[PDB]
Design a protein around this nucleic acid. Structure first.
Ligand SMILES: Cc1cn([C@H]2C[C@H](O)[C@@H](COP(=O)(O)OP(=O)(O)OP(=O)(O)O)O2)c(=O)[nH]c1=O
Ligand SMILES: [Mg+2]
Ligand SMILES: [Mg+2]
Length: 538
DNA sequence: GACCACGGCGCT
DNA sequence: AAGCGCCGTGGTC
């Protein structure tokens, strides 16, 4: 059924890249399939110009490569997105092919044929699935186009600044390393947790608190080291060493080497079918975990800057997952807290502790805040105790007071788990599903871990759905204003706008995000503008 | 060179 | 006793 290039309109495309990252890949081959024919491009790059849309497996990646080459080729249907909506464990084309009727090979024509067959089969599985079809048409398919533009646009990085920082950090790492070795009485590989374990617990006389999950070694995690801050001077030094080497090896050193020759910018990938909950992920490099908490972390974040003549605009939803929880659970006291525009963590501290706000102390707000996020994950009293460094019994008390103030939260958790046990899956506000079979595991630890995954998903997933919908609504407004969407970090968007229009863009983006989908509580968005990512977050 | 599992840890 | 991706180590191929 081999036919001459080019294919008719509406054909499914297949393509092969020299490497997974579309901004860096050579397009090795290109083909298209339709109506019982397969068309193979004699020269892929030139053939790219013949296509109206990228329709097929991994359509976004081909679109990114096209945008890189100055071609406006938007992604359309992609069987990966259909499969992911059916079951978010469908994350790879290898797996999706095996499950839905083919094999993911290394040949373009075969990939084109596969895309066509998988689309037909998967489209059929979605029929009747009204809510999933709505997510596909109104969120996932249009979002893929937005993501392609974001990937191809990239973000500006101050490379010289990072190079300079590297040299300074190297000197400080040396000071810490040298002092650790002196305290140990000998040098060893401070990067090896296996060697460190022996030094701390065997050679020195330190008590080993916890064990590691898979192999049961004595843990040297920060949680353990923190508990040992007073046991020996070597511990604090190790904590400092860990912080510095983590940031140097993961951000300071690698990032400057990833600037693209043609754009002069750093380009991530936004993976659309990678998580169990419907969140996006980011890779090669991951720009969703750039440091921000510590002083050195903040120094790194300052390296992300706006193009000359432009500004960054950073918009963050305030406590979106807690607001989603209020809506899903219908808890009146939680809803009241938000509807009143009061500081969530301070206000929650008022409810527990039984004191008016203004009387809420710094430590009390901390407890409330830790609980406010912890409840989303199924955080236990033991864990809370360690996080706040308070007596186990105090931690227990705090958790009980929380559920006594917000009783419908516990009720929603229990209802969600019961329904999940029955149906075998849980769902977001929009109907995105996650299958969680271990809800009926006979091993308590396994079952309870499954429960925490299960009741978190509707919260995290609804928050993800809302952010995705916001991006889809916001993108065409930005293009009209000559602004750019650069990054998404789960509950935050980073935009780049010409200086003259930054204020207007910030106001507009804030309004689009706050009004994306009205809930029983208001969505609040914090917005900042600045020359670098840190200064744009205020 | 590449792959892996693991512990560990950065962000949401 | 939530969701990710990336680091170095140790082990392997
Ligand atoms: C602490 C914490 C934060 N986050 C995310 C949610 C948000 C983002 C920023 O965290 P914070 O700024 O620390 O949370 P916050 O804005 O609600 O608290 P504050 O009023 O003091 O500013 O990090 C989690 O997802 N899980 C957590 O446990
Ligand atoms: Mg905050
Ligand atoms: Mg792991």
């Amino acid at each position: 059924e081999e036919a001459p290039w080019p294919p008719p309109e509406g054909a499914f495309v297949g393509f092969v890249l020299s490497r997974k990252e579309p901004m860096w890949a050579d397009l090795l081959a290109l083909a298209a399939a339709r109506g019982g024919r397969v068309h193979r491009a004699p020269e892929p790059y030139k053939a790219l110009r013949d296509l109206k849309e990228a329709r097929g497996l991994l359509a976004k990646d081909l679109s990114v490569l096209a945008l890189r080459e100055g071609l406006g080729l938007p992604p359309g249907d992609d069987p990966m997105l259909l499969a992911y909506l059916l079951d978010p464990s469908n994350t790879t084309p290898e797996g999706v092919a095996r499950r839905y009727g083919g094999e993911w090979t290394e040949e373009a024509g075969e990939r084109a044929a596969l895309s066509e067959r998988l689309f037909a089969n998967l489209w059929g599985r979605l029929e009747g699935e009204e809510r999933l079809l709505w997510l596909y048409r109104e969120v996932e398919r249009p979002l893929s186009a937005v993501l392609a533009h974001m990937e191809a646009t990239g973000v500006r990085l101050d490379v010289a600044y990072l190079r300079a920082l590297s040299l300074e950090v190297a000197e400080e790492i040396a000071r810490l390393e040298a002092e650790v070795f002196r305290l140990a009485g000998h040098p060893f590989n401070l990067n090896s947790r296996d060697q460190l374990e022996r030094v701390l617990f065997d050679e020195l006389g330190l008590p080993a608190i916890g064990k590691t999950e898979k192999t049961g070694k004595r843990s040297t995690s920060a949680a353990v080291l923190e508990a040992l801050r007073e046991a020996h001077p070597i511990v604090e030094k190790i904590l400092q060493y860990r912080e510095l080497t983590k940031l140097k090896s993961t951000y300071i050193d690698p990032l400057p080497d990833l600037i693209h020759p043609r754009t002069g910018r750093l380009h991530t990938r936004f993976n659309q079918t990678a998580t169990a909950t419907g969140r996006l992920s980011s890779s090669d490099p991951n720009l969703q975990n750039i440091p921000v908490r510590t002083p050195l972390g903040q120094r790194i974040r300052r390296a992300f800057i706006a193009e000359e003549g432009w500004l960054l605009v950073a918009l963050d939803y305030s406590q979106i997952e807690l607001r989603v929880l209020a809506h899903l659970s219908g808890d009146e006291n939680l809803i009241r807290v938000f509807q009143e525009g009061r500081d969530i963590h301070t206000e929650t501290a008022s409810w527990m502790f039984g004191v008016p706000r203004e009387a809420v102390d710094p430590l009390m707000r901390r407890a409330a805040k830790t609980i406010n996020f912890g409840v989303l994950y199924g955080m236990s009293a033991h864990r809370l105790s360690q996080e706040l460094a308070i007596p186990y019994e105090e931690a227990q008390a705090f958790i009980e007071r929380y559920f006594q103030s917000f009783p419908k939260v516990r009720a929603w958790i229990e209802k969600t788990l019961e329904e999940g046990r029955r149906r075998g899956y849980v769902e977001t506000l929009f109907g995105r599903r996650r299958y969680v079979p271990d809800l009926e595991a006979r091993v308590k630890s396994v079952r309870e871990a499954a429960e925490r995954m299960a009741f978190n998903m509707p919260v995290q997933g609804t928050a993800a759905d809302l952010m995705k919908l916001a991006m889809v609504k916001l993108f065409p407004r930005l293009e009209e204003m000559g602004a750019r969407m650069l990054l998404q970090v789960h509950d935050e968007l980073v935009l780049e706008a010409p200086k003259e229009r930054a204020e207007a863009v910030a106001r507009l983006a804030k309004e689009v995000m706050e009004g994306v989908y009205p809930l029983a509580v208001p969505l609040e968005v914090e917005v900042g503008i600045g020359e670098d990512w840190l200064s744009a977050k205020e």
